[PDB]
């Protein structure tokens, strides 16, 4: 009665593992990396029914970003100065002039014998340094000399985190989950097809997620496994928290020719008082925000248990502090002033976070490399949107006494999956068969 009939152009698909294009300043690395334009993207096609299954914890788009962002970064800064010759014994004293007390011992004033453009002459030069980049001998040396020759990031390369969009290649499509409050896994009932994702800013940070998207309705707490203390908990806020960060001290920059076309940028004398870098977080806003987080958090905890927030104890700066880059400088701020509370499970104007900065930055774990950010002249003023948090559980024996929770670090994948959870890529499979009542 029926014979095989072949149908081509059948609207079906399978899970894909593919490479997305990227789509979009002169100096900005992402601006020059992907020129593929995007903006006129009312290309979203609602799919009735479907109910596609998503799993953000296995999302290979996150993995792609990790690989490509690191590559772009390294490629962009590979052809710069390579300040191997800066790794010499330094003669240092502390900067002790127009300073505050919180800066005592923070800055060093070091002199050294630097090469000149001629391979027979040396010059006496000096630079100010942050103590976090300089290690005492038994005289001082730069800390990186233990593992790596370092470079100098090019002053003409911009890492402003302009948003980029990802687009699927022909034969592939991206399924977007529109299920409001989708936790991150399972049968998303409302999906649409796009060729290109919305723009995501490639912002690098620990503890606090900055300038990402906000939840459409209510604060969302999600994790791969909420009962596993080995897993991170990602929290998306439905409102931003305003954070104002600054680097006081009007700095200047020297330019030293160390070789035939090789310039090194030293930190020169500071104009005005020397003060500590810091961030200002609205007190009330933060309070309200965590109140919402705990009210949601309680979904997975015992009745009237007591929940606390605590100091980010751990072994390093990328573990215990809030790292970020703004104004071109790398900040390591102390967030213990934020994560300090008890919610009682029955309760009824600016937190200042002291902050330090560094120039010799490894970026992504690693043993060697490191980019020596050059000095920035003048002062830095940054205002950001805290859009989310990364936290962990203690996982101890339970005798009431719920986790005191700590913010923490991790690799960059967790700062992207927080946005990428909405997308899945599938392969289109247009060829298939069905029985039909026909013959040639």
């Amino acid at each position, epitope marked *: 009665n029926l014979w095989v009939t072949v149908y081509y152009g059948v609207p079906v698909w399978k899970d894909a593992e593919t490479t997305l294009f990227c789509a979009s300043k002169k100096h900005n690395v992402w601006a020059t990396h992907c020129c593929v334009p995007t903006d006129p993207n009312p290309q979203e096609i609602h799919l009735e029914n479907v109910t596609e299954e998503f799993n953000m914890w296995k999302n290979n788009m996150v993995e792609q970003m990790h690989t490509d962002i690191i590559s772009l970064w390294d490629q962009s800064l590979k052809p710069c100065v390579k300040l191997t010759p800066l790794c010499v014994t330094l003669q240092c004293t502390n900067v002790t002039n127009n300073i505050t007390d919180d800066m005592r011992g923070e800055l060093k004033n070091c002199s050294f014998n630097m090469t000149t453009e001629l391979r027979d002459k040396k010059q006496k030069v000096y630079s100010l340094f942050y103590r976090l980049d300089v290690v005492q001998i038994n005289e001082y040396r730069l800390i990186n000399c233990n593992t790596s020759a370092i470079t100098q990031a090019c002053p003409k390369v911009s890492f402003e985190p302009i948003p980029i969009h990802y687009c699927a290649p022909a034969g592939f499509a991206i399924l977007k989950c529109k299920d409001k409050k989708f936790n991150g896994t399972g049968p998303c009932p409302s999906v649409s097809t796009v060729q290109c994702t919305h723009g995501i800013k490639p912002v690098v940070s620990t503890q606090l997620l900055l300038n990402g998207s906000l939840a459409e309705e*209510e604060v969302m707490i999600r994790s791969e496994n909420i009962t596993n203390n080995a897993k991170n908990i990602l929290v998306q806020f*439905n409102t931003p928290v305003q954070i104002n960060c600054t680097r006081p001290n009007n700095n200047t920059r020297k330019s030293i020719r160390i070789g035939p076309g090789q310039w090194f940028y030293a930190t020169g004398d500071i104009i005005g008082d020397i003060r500590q870098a810091h961030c200002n977080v609205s007190k009330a806003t933060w309070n309200e925000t965590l109140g919402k987080v705990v009210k949601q958090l309680r979904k997975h905890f015992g009745n009237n248990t007591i929940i606390r927030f605590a100091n980010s104890s751990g072994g390093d700066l990328e573990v215990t502090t809030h790292s970020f880059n703004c104004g071109g400088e790398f900040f390591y701020c102390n967030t213990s002033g934020l994560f300090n509370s008890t919610w009682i499970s029955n309760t009824s104007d600016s937190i200042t976070l002291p902050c330090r900065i560094k120039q010799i930055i490894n970026m992504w774990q690693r043993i060697g490399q490191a980019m020596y950010a050059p000095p920035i002249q003048g002062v830095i003023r940054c205002v950001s949107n805290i859009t989310g948090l990364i936290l962990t559980r203690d996982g101890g024996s339970t005798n009431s006494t719920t986790e005191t929770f700590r913010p923490g670090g991790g690799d960059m994948r967790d700062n992207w999956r927080s946005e990428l959870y909405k997308y899945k890529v599938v392969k289109i499979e247009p060829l298939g068969v069905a029985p039909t009542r026909c013959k040639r």
Partner: nanobody
Amino acid sequence: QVQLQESGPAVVQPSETLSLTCAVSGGSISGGYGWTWIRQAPGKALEWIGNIYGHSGSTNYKSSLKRRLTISTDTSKNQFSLKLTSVTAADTAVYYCARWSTADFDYWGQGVLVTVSS
């Protein structure tokens, strides 16, 4: 802290539009909260109507009312409101506004008893 307060017509005639406004004080209309309309018909259990978010719209309506019901806000007066067209006798209820947060309604107003009658 937060105080909600409803106002509007106590009597609406059949076929007309009912419009109730819930003023918000003690907090902002623009916050990340679900502004919600709920009504309790006389002699009946409480029934959910719908909601709107202070920072995003992104409303939720009882589907049976979606062709008659509009929920919106006005940030200049720090208020939200319920607009229901083509009212009938079955819509007699005391309407309350409430503030939804995560798992419950933290704040409630006083309510407006609305009768649908010529």
